[PDB]
Amino acid sequence: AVVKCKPTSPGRRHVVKVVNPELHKGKPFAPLLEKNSKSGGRNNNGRITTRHIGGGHKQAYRIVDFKRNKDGIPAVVERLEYDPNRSANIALVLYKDGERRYILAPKGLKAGDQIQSGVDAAIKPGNTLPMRNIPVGSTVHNVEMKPGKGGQLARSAGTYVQIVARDGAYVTLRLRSGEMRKVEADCRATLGEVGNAEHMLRVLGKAGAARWRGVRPTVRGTAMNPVDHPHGGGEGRNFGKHPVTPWGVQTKGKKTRSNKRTDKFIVRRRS
Amino acid sequence: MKRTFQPSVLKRNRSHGFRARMATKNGRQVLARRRAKGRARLTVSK
């Protein structure tokens, strides 16, 4: 649930917490963990390539299963877990053959729930089956775009996709963006919505909270000198130019999709 | 007042030492230059 914190200090006043009691209070499943060091938004050349990244808390990498290939074995949900690496919540599941995996926790999922992947699998939340097997009009998440690759669409805290149509070898998806997209009908998808839907209701409430999430502060181009940004300079507050990136490209409207290879799959762009 | 030079032997060697100079071309040229000049101490190496 969301929780407005009492204003016992400025910087706590405007805070809203998103508290799920059902998450695991404990150390995660260590076998599925692995190291994940921070970039600072800097590439192999050592240059900053994406500004405003830096610092934040040390995080491990949970090995989430997005490919979801344990066909026919039924699994049961052991617990839900906090993943620092994503807006969603993860679920530690236990297959009957003794293997455990992390999966995106869907909306209704909880400890004790049974889930299943496969063509034969049942059409219920958390189950995963090819979209030619999934009825039209259903909500799914963790959608593969290429068969066998692993889910790439609809992984964020409260996303999902609509299968609006199945026309032969393809099905047409309604993406969260509003973009309509063809996808091969043999690609895989998980039933239901992804879990942590009130994720958006949280509000950080202070500068430090943003820092905790590895986000360095943002300087406005207009606050700079001309040598730095197109917006710089001006005695007092001047802005007599069309908005642009630090690299001179228009920002308020100018489209930038250039991919002519996948134009065919886009049924309708978002609006 | 913390002045610029804050010595550290290892750091000195890695930065300027013989092997470092050897590693890259430009360093090798520097070495050659110094040899030509007649430098007694070719490198920072003690």
Added chain:
Amino acid sequence: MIREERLLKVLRAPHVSEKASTAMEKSNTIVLKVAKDATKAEIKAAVQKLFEVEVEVVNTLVVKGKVKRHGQRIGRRSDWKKAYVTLKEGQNLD
């Protein structure tokens, strides 16, 4: 097993000093100058063969050379290896 020639080349000299004299008299320990490359076991072997005397143990150390100035010109003395060789109880050395 150390070669005789190497053994002979190990031992440079006896070291005379107050501390050395004290070590000799009290702890039955001789203080030698030895080759800088000479290891402890080597030194011991050489002691045993060339002075004909049982060794308990050898401690070694490296003496660094002093920087001196002859007139205006600076110059450094050689470093050299010192060895305290402790000799078995009742071992009297000439």
Added chain:
RNA sequence: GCUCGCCGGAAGACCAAGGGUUCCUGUCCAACGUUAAUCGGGGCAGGGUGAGUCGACCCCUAAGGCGAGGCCGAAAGGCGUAGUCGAUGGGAAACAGGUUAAUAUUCCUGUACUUGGUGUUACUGCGAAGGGGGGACGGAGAAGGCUAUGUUGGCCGGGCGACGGUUGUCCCGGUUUAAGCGUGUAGGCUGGUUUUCCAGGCAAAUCCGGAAAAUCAAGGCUGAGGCGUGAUGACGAGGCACUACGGUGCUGAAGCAACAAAUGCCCUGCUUCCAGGAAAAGCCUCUAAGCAUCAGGUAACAUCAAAUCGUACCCCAAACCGACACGGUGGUCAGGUAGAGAAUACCAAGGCGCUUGAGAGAACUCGGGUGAAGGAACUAGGCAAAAUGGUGCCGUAACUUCGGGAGAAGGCACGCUGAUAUGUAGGUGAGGUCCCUCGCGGAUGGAGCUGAAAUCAGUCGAAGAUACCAGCUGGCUGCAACUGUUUAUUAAAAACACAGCACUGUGCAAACACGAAAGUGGACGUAUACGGUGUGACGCCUCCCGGUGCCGGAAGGUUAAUU
């Protein structure tokens, strides 16, 4: 040598880094030392640094670096796989005393430990580049158990006072002891043991994981401290022999108890929070190829082994970074009285008086003290000074986002002695007595020790939070919501950031950014996400598309290479 003075969470002690002989001894005083110099971190000569257990080396890896092939690139070269390097992190082992002019966990004395070989007898499944476990991990908070350490008493030794008193409820000093081995406690974690099966752990697995079934409630792991031993020892106040006045040799009492107590240890624990918290090896374990009655494994016992390098000295400084014998510099140690305290004052241990002195006692300058009467009249401006200053209790407005405002404001008490109470409330806790699955056990018990806070009565002073220490307060108002950041060296702000808001892009080989490219970041993320732009908590809100941009359109006009 005796006085005086200063530091004492340092101006003491020990290290790292960095320096590199500055260490110690003798000797010299030209130069160096802001003066003199017999002295010196100066000159010259000699001496000095001892390790299986400290550190490096070594095994393991992080960020990162290099990188066979490889991909890419006019050349140079870039990226990067396998790999290999890389500590600031993980990985076996030593303590006490004595000694040098100068080293010491390194020498000596005592008492230990480690992990390798080799050989043994005893046994008999060993075996990895592979599987599993472990190592392995955050912040804050709370206690409880402890010790370091300190105080008092007891004990032991010495003393009987340069001036009134001082054989006592008097004075001074000491009252220390390790690692190791044994015990396995306060406490923490977890249900154990056996059997059966199984699409999992790249193959196999007796291991892990998962299913069942049986049976017992104690099983294991961890763990400070204490106790015992170590120790008939060592050390020991000071006494006694020699004296090159430096010291050397002999000798040696007591060596207990209580209370208090860490920020250190149990604790890598427990509780809790969200921001969700290295890796690999060592270590344990499982098997595979293999080998097969051999090797290898574990078992004690014997022997050998532990190489190499560092070890002096300075290290908040006269030895490092600052041109100087001139501010900066990470870690560890942390006594007493008062105190909340690592603040502050005075002291201990220890270390210093800052390498020019001697006079004088003009102006003026600096740093301080006090000041009649006035009390901001000063001044751009109360700048600067002065003032406030503690604990407890009473009391406290507008406004408010109901948290605040608020230590609002303002007041009262405060020393010492006695009594309550030859020391209370509390804390601690010995004997005795009882129980007992027997121990570091449980009950009862209260000796002794410690010990606030209050009330009443008296008492001194001008003054009792007496020194050091230690808020000035209130009223209206602009700006910025707030904590933050900033022009290293004239600007700390109303500037930047901020949480929040909005627009816009981006469907993943994402947009974008660094890259002739390969590739990398974005992101091991996927529209509840990421990028860009503006605005900037919260509250109430928030006409013009002509111009320039952007988006969409494509009927016509115009229009490249080409032909």
Added chain:
RNA sequence: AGGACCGAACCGACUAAUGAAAAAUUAGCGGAUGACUUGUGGCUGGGGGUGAAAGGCCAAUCAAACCGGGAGAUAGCU
């Protein structure tokens, strides 16, 4: 609990007066569990880096570092 309060260490640098000091002193001053601070090592390179943005910082040097080279640049100027 807290980018909570008072306050030493530690980090800073608002006022003040005053070469030992190429930015210090003393007296006061701000933060002081965090958007903190700090040691060791690593990475980013010059029209490049980094920048809570001041044209700040990048070895006492910054509206384009330093070293060497073109180079005896050019100088209707002194």
